[PDB]
Design an enzyme around this catalytic site. Structure first.
Site, PDB file in Angstrom:
ATOM      1  CE  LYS C 259      -3.874  -2.191   2.412  1.00 40.77           C
ATOM      2  NZ  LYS C 259      -4.813  -2.207   1.311  1.00 40.77           N
ATOM      3  NE  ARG C 333     -10.043  -9.240  -2.542  1.00 39.79           N
ATOM      4  CZ  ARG C 333      -9.630  -8.741  -1.309  1.00 39.79           C
ATOM      5  NH1 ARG C 333      -9.548  -9.403  -0.142  1.00 39.79           N
ATOM      6  NH2 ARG C 333      -9.228  -7.481  -1.215  1.00 39.79           N
TER       7      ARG C 333
HETATM    8 MG   LIG Z   1      -5.967  -5.796   1.374  1.00 43.47          MG
END
Ligand SMILES: [Mg+2]
Ligand SMILES: [Mg+2]
Ligand SMILES: [Mg+2]
Ligand SMILES: [Zn+2]
Ligand SMILES: [Zn+2]
Ligand SMILES: [Zn+2]
Lengths: 481, 321, 481
Positions: C259, C333
């Site tokens: 990120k 996920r």
């Molecule tokens: Mg993530």
């Protein structure tokens, strides 16, 4: 009928009131004092409490915290502080009367008639005009009558700032290079008749060999207007002036060297240079100060087009120097190379130019102080002392050959609009302007950090801030006296 | 100065948190025998409750070392000192809040805070100046890892205040919250801390002057006059409540490492350090603009510049005389 | 002694009070009514006015606007609205008593005992714990005594949400994969003794062949903990359960697919999946609802390291399917591929999984509603009706083969963590989870938009919002009844 803003300070034996407050207490027979006890804690600075129905004629008596009674010049914060307190405290108060939808309000002198006024007014300002949904237009008169000359100095000083705030704030589709001039001229002439205005057009600027300001305008189809303000304060006309210059890009999109969509709608205030100094003269003429001052501000816009200023372009400033235009967003530098050159014609005493020039300034100090470079320690002193009083700080910044050096080496030309590197942003840019100045008392004031307010200055609401107009006004008051 | 220039300049694989201390101690002791050094390890820093400096180190596997310099110049030992503090990230990669590959190899000089002030004491001891000075510099590294300091983290500085660690690259602020707190133990006269803290400083003045914030006009004067002499300029910068305000509102904690907005960078960061300082003569010197030279200063070749070491030296000469 | 929150509505002949308010007026002999006139305009919804000293024992009587008396289910806004009014209005009120530093407050039922409570409590919550500088801890009891069972339903429901808000909000250095489990277990067991907890470690997860959750954890040195909650509400134990699953990345840095530093400190609430549903069971056990529910939440962290999950990696979920791990930030996920597979072991009736999965969801609806995909219209109905009541909206989102298709074509493997293209973000990701679900009543709830609040929901202060916990609670109440 109407509301009232009262003030109080911190402890001694029981937190003292400002005499308006003391007076109003005796009047409702102590029951203001009494309910203050009943209500909650005491009111530290800027805090606010609202007491209904204590008075017949004053439904809402808001009491606001004034901090320390003897609160004064702060060595660290670089300002008078009582003033700073009073400004946020009646601002706080007046925004409570305005949310109670009370169209008129009476206000505690708070020991500094001027400061409570610059609070009540700066405090209440919005720029309502384009919403049909507007807050009540509350009217703020003094409470009392003993000290009227300085509260009006408040309302004066705060209004000339509010001027700039509406001149910056308004969309650059409305507030154009012409409509800015129209209002200013109108504001200067309603200030005094000892005034002349010259909304000089392209032909005259063409005639002036202002190649650099012109190179900038040519992107837009909106007309350049070089503006000339005059106020003949001096008893003998022939006293040479103080000259204010100011950048007036009404809209800056960067041009071919084009900006990001992220908050570009604030570039409608890239005419803050022009607005601030103009409001200062409008104000020095209302004060009718024994000095001749000259407003000079190239108004035009930066846009991309089939005839916009390109990267790599060498253009000619009035004074004979050429400029490589490497970045079309460094354009205040060019608009200002020329009105700076024109400033010397006037044989000034002080040439204060002002502009929303670099985002780097914003990175620098960022709304604390308006960064000021100046080849004059005398001049620096002068702006700074004025800033102590008014609270709109100013921070000296370096005008070192170091920085000139970077701007001066230039592939094509005599000067480059952006210097050799990323670093030292405002200094590089101020180094560029000195190449267009030979006077012993020049001052660059980069206003890019004080272009906006959110919460940083208490008594200003969110939106264009209009800084450092009162410090400029206060400087010319003191220079006149 | 050349000392600092080799201490900054050398790759952070060689010039570690320990090897920096080794050379300094060696340089200080060959300067005068009126000197003690303390290359204090993790255990002692753990012991010191230097939560904030520690939170920073834990990314790397390279050891923290809090360094303690001493020079007892004063005839009477008991004269309270002048204390220099200095940030010593030997390498700053930003950590989890990780840097761009564009010229990150200069972060090998994010220990310039530590290097400059250390070279100044090494020098004030060669001059053997009638003053007791104390070098204090948290040496450690910023890296990303399975145990690196995360975004959102509240950590505890020595002094009891908590810090939201919102950006792992604002880490000098944390390494310095603690050695600043430790400075007061020494009952100093002057606490000059120095650091390569913000790129914003570089955007500010950028190698002209080394920006200095200080709650002391007296102190400002002092650094500035010295800078007149030496030529390594210094420019005062604001330490206004304005700026504190932004750092102080904090979701989780008592202080946040980056302030509310983009603007006013060096001032926000200096506002953070004052929260860790109660002394009347403190000075933050942000050296991020003078970290490098190319051509700006003539007499320095290209590479780490080692600034403002002589102005620091010259100040302690003049303060001693 | 203490403050009081009174309510009033809009006009008829003179704006009516809530009966607590009417009562308290008669009591000070009309003079609350009387001062309201004197004070200013009337109080539209959520607005607030504070009247000191009307009462001896109640220094501060705040009156708040309740909007329309008969305000109800809104066809457009998809909620009950009176409730929504009452929630912001006493929230508004309670935050005024808390700023008056009044440690205890009494509160108007406002016709909906439950709503004024979920307002007073949600309204007052902060997560003060790590500042030494904290606001007063005000205590909010009901005003009256006639309706106590539903105000406590308020305080209950609001608290279980506040739970999640402190579980999300706390830094991921403190609130780890273990400390989250420690508190939950503690909260579930203090809720009822008809409960078992299993803070299962790496060995058990290794044993469970939860390849995919494990691949994720291995970046950090902080331990994985797969958590197992149980509440045996049913009279007959053997009723098969409702199973809640929830993603519990305590910190998400993206991992190797790392990120931006821009606001990554909010990823401390990427365990909001785990927190929300956990708070719901803690709450369904305090309500002690005639249903067996099972909390399942893989707690672990995403970090970069010498042993972090790499781009291109095929890993094996419990169920035999392989996953290309193309983006290390699509990790909910994978953590969820496995606890979803484990959910079927329990022979559930409903498998509601919940997670802060995609920023795309945030781009989608963004804090209005918590997007919910579900192969069950029945189930959709159920969550939605509950959301009408509670006001924490939910919006159905598509679970179409269209989307599966993109996730399913895969170079190396059986499923890919990110689908073929940029578009359709939350749907792609929900399409990935259905590959790990064969049950007829599954529900993905993507909570990435309701992770935070600023001002959007009135009665929540700025910070982790803890949504949609009460809609989940309310669903299991209604499913139990
Ligand atoms: Mg993530
Ligand atoms: Mg520009
Ligand atoms: Mg850094
Ligand atoms: Zn511009
Ligand atoms: Zn650093
Ligand atoms: Zn995630």
């Amino acid at each position: 009928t109407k509301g009232l803003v009262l003030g109080i300070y911190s402890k001694e034996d029981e937190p003292q009131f400002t005499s308006a407050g003391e007076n109003f207490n005796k009047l409702v027979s102590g029951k203001l004092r009494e309910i203050l006890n009943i209500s909650g804690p005491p009111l530290k600075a800027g805090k606010t409490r609202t007491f209904y129905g204590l008075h017949e004629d004053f439904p809402s008596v808001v009491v606001v915290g004034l901090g320390k009674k003897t609160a004064g010049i702060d060595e660290q914060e670089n300002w008078h502080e009582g003033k700073e307190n009073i400004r946020a405290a009646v601002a706080a108060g007046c925004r409570q009367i305005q949310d109670l939808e009370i169209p008129s309000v009476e206000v505690d002198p708070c020991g500094d008639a001027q400061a409570a006024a610059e609070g009540a007014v700066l405090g209440l300002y919005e720029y309502d005009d384009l919403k049909q949904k507007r807050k009540v237009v509350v009217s703020a008169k003094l409470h009392g009558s003993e000290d009227q000359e300085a509260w009006q100095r408040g309302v004066l000083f705060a209004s000339g700032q509010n001027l700039a705030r509406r001149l910056m704030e308004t969309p650059a589709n409305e507030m154009t290079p012409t409509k800015f001039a129209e209002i200013v001229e109108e504001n200067l002439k309603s200030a005094s008749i000892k005034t002349d205005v010259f909304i000089r057009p392209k032909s005259w600027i063409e005639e002036q060999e202002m190649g650099s300001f012109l190179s900038v305008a040519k992107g837009s189809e909106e007309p350049p207007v070089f503006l000339e303000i005059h106020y003949k304060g001096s008893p003998n006309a022939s006293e040479p002036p103080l000259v204010f210059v100011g950048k007036g890009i009404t809209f800056d999109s960067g041009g071919i060297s084009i900006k990001a969509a992220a908050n570009m709608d604030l570039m409608r205030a890239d005419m803050g240079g022009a607005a601030t100094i103009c409001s200062a003269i409008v104000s020095a003429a209302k004060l009718d100060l024994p000095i001749n001052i000259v407003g000079l501000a190239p108004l035009c816009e930066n846009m991309p087009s089939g005839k916009a200023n390109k990267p790599g372009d060498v253009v000619r400033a009035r004074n004979g120097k050429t400029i490589q235009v490497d970045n079309t967003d460094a354009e205040g530098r060019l608009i200002l190379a020329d009105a700076l050159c024109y400033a010397h014609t006037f044989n000034p005493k002080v040439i204060i130019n002002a502009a929303t020039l670099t985002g780097a300034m914003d990175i620098a100090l960022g709304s604390g102080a308006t960064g000021v470079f100046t080849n004059s320690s005398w001049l620096w002193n002068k702006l700074f002392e004025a800033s102590i009083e008014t609270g709109d700080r100013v921070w000296r910044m370096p005008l070192f050959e170091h920085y000139t050096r970077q701007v001066i080496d230039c592939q094509l030309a005599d000067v480059n609009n952006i210097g050799k590197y990323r670093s030292a942003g405002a200094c590089t840019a101020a180094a560029f302007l000195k190449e267009f100045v030979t006077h012993p008392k020049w001052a660059h004031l980069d206003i890019a950090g004080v272009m906006t307010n959110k919460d940083e200055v208490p008594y200003l609401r969110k939106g264009m801030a209009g800084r450092p107009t009162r410090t400029l006004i206060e400087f010319l008051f003191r220079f006149s006296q």
